[PDB]
Structures are given as C-alpha cells and as structure tokens.
C-alpha cells in the first residue's frame, strides 16, 4: 500500500545541459507539487531540469532547504524540497513521515527508485545506525543521515527509503549517497514537512 503509494510519487529527474543529459537522479513527491530531491543536485551545471518528462527552468519552481541541528550549530540536509509553481498534484504522503529515528538497528528497509537509468526498482537492505555527520568521498559532508546495508548505485539519490517502526511502515527520508555495502539517506522530519506544507 505505502510502497505502492510512494512508487507512484517517485518521478525520474534529468539535468539537461546543451541538449544533452548531464545528470540523472530521482524525485519523491510528498504533497501538492512539492518533491523531495537531492540538494547536491543543484550544485551541478544545468540549464533545464527534466521532471517526469517535463522540462523546467529555475523560474518554474522554488527550492527550500532543511537545516538540521548537529552539535549546536545548524547544517544543511541533503534533503531539499522542490516546489513547482504549476504542476499535476501528487498524493499527499507527509502523514507517513516521522519526527525521530523511530527505527532500530536491523529493521527492514526499502528504497524506492524511478529514474532514466534503471527505470522503476526497489532495493531492500537492513537498517544500520543513525549518523550525525557523514563525510563523503569528495571531501564534502552531509547532516542527519541514516545508515543501512543495501546495494545502492549512483542515480538512486532522491528515492524514498522506508522502514518498519513496529508494524508500521514509515518513510525515513531520501537517498543521497552510498558506498561499499552501505547506503545513506537524508532524514526528513515529519514536522519539517508539515510546516513546509502550511508554509506553501
């Protein structure tokens, strides 16, 4: 139900630069015309963002960023919200997120993917541990990540990761980086989504 629900909200994203596809990733719609996407996505050089086959330019949407408290100072989550101005509504699924690491080391985790690279797909692994600040292979760093044992690949960024709190299935947040047996998703707070929705 939920997994079938989130797959429905997952759209393929392509970055276009001079008629060529320069970047591929995913997008997870949470409500209205708002989607959760990798923030490091906009760090790339593009002139058009393809969302579900629809080409758009920067004046077509707004990107709000989430800031998370990590040891006093606040940092920028790799989970960015892309709110389109005009667009086909998606199924509001915010009520399926939560406000804390409501998981437990070793619980069923499922990543939902849908991009131009491997089409629609599901990857399943084990919940590992929560991470305050993870340092990437390119020397960069990301806040509020959740670690897990799962076979992930480039392009899976932006896909929703869901666990099993009790007999409940809840969306943890979006996939950002993966390396060597362990995938990492950028955790998104349920509260954070609600205010953002009231905000828009």
């Amino acid at each position: 139900d939920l997994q079938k629900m989130v797959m429905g909200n997952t759209k393929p994203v392509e970055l276009i630069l001079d008629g060529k596809t320069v970047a591929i990733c995913c997008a997870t719609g949470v409500f209205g015309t708002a989607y959760l996407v990798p923030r490091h996505l906009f760090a790339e050089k593009y002139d058009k963002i393809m969302l579900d086959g629809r080409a758009m330019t920067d004046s077509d949407y707004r990107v709000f960023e989430f800031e998370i408290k990590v040891k006093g100072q606040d940092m920028l989550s790799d989970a960015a919200l892309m709110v389109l101005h005009r667009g086909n509504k998606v199924r509001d699924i915010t009520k399926h997120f939560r406000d804390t690491a409501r998981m437990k080391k070793g619980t069923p985790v499922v990543g939902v993917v849908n991009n131009a690279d491997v089409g629609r797909l599901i990857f399943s692994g084990e919940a590992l541990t929560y991470k305050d600040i993870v340092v990437l292979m390119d020397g960069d760093t990301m806040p509020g990540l959740f670690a897990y044992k799962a076979a992930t690949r480039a392009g899976y960024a932006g896909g929703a990761v869901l666990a099993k709190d009790g007999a409940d299935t809840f969306i943890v947040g979006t996939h950002s980086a993966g390396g060597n047996g362990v995938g990492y998703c950028s955790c998104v707070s349920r509260s954070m989504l609600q205010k953002m929705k009231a905000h828009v």
């Binding site: 320069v22 591929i24 990733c25 790339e44 990437l136 992930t152 690949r153 480039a154 060597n180």
Partner: peptide
C-alpha cells in the same frame, strides 16, 4: 567513504 549517489556524466 560514501559518494553522493547522484548520476553524473
């Protein structure tokens, strides 16, 4: 060391 899993060309 995990790498950002966006697909770059």
């Amino acid at each position: 060391a995990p790498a950002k899993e966006l697909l770059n060309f």
